[PDB]
Symmetry: none
Subunit: 59 residues, 2 copies
């Protein structure tokens, strides 16, 4: 249960469970998943969803 | 296509031994990482955090 930060923005793939975000957004990681993905909650939008792991860094 | 979606088990499943299928309980949720051309998919079970193969016939999309 750690916080990670977006280093770049991301626009979700339509009709999927991915979420869009902005550089600087903070997320709480719920599941690491396979390398390359993460199941998280974006603290700014309060949205739970799938994100691309290479766009976030440890804080 | 269930790619990049969260899906939920509609029935339990016990893996075939010596395969990389994963056993799961009804209600378990998963994130789909790869969809193979036979209905099977590489996923992560959100409860156990294990990666493995599950078949699409046993799950339904539930959204975020």
């Amino acid at each position: 249960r750690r916080r990670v930060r977006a280093i770049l923005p991301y626009t979700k793939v339509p009709d999927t469970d991915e979420i869009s975000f902005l550089k600087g957004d903070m997320f709480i990681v719920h599941n690491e998943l396979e390398d390359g993905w993460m199941w998280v909650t974006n603290l700014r939008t309060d949205e739970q969803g799938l994100i691309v792991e290479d766009l976030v860094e440890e804080v």
